[PDB]
Amino acid sequence: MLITKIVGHIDDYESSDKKVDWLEVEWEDLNKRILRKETENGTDIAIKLENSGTLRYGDVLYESDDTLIAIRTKLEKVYVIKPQTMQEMGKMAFEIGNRHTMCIIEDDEILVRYDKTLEKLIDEVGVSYEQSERRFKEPFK
Amino acid sequence: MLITKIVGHIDDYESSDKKVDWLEVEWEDLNKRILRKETENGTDIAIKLENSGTLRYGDVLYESDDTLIAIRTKLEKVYVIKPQTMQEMGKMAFEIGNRHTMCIIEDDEILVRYDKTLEKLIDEVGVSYEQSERRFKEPFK
Ligand code: NI
Ligand SMILES: [Zn+2]
Numbered sequence A, B: 001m002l003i004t005k006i007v008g009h010i011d012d013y014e015s016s017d018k019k020v021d022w023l024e025v026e027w028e029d030l031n032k033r034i035l036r037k038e039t040e041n042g043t044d045i046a047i048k049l050e051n052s053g054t055l056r057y058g059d060v061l062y063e064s065d066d067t068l069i070a071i072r073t074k075l076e077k078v079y080v081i082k083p084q085t086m087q088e089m090g091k092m093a094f095e096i097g098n099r100h101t102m103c104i105i106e107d108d109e110i111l112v113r114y115d116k117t118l119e120k121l122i123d124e125v126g127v128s129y130e131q132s133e134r135r136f137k138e139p140f141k
Helices: A085-098 A116-125 B086-098 B118-127
Strands: A019-025 A034-039 A044-048 A058-065 A068-071 A075-082 A104-107 A107-115 A128-135 B019-025 B034-038 B043-049 B057-063 B065-072 B075-079 B102-106 B109-113 B127-135
Touching: A019 A034, A044 B065, A068 A128, A075 A116, A085 B086, A085 B102, A104 B086, A128 B127, B019 B034, B043 B057, B057 B127, B075 B118
Parallel strands: A019 A068, B019 B065
Antiparallel strands: A034 A044, A058 A068, A075 A107, A075 A128, A104 A107, B034 B043, B057 B065, B075 B109, B075 B127, B102 B109
């Protein structure tokens, strides 16, 4: 199926009886215009967005009488880094920046992909972190 | 005069009546082992530290009956970036690290060299800053 435009937002279908076939994408895929990937049900999707438009989490790509195809990012292992002080947030984020590692910084936390080599740097900086799962919902960037 | 060992720490001399003759160095001179420069009073200093020694801010190189020669870095034009939230500290430090800009992060402040091209970036993150004159006191590792 070639997809040239986004046709809705998956939250708007909360009471719909239509079944969702999820197209699961990488964090990198957020805000792309061109993407080729297969859905959880095996439907081949070629996204070639005709607007200067770009993909977001929870966009609906296709609506039939009974089915919705909608985007979400994959559920993946993360570290939630929890600096306690401003100096801590600064040194940690600097070292992440310097490494060119993708992250999301919201309030007093830094979210990064699980990675054992980075875990060793988190320890040099000396910040507490917790390991968890998330679907990345915002583009980087 | 040849210096092959450091003889003290300038902060320990608070009570002293001796005059300090500062040897002013560049930020990049810290942790060097060899350097030759004149003091603010015109004394030629030839540092060649003996056994893997390295220079630090505040090192006393020479003490006479009336004088202390000590290292400090030059006063130079800086931005002092004054992030008001954890989120501000983390975003700003990430962006500095990502560009590989030398900085010192101490408590709630990021100190960088005066550099007009950075104002666009600081503005983009949205963080208060003031332009000022400071000495950089730690080597950039
Ligand atoms: Ni680089
Ligand atoms: Zn909606």
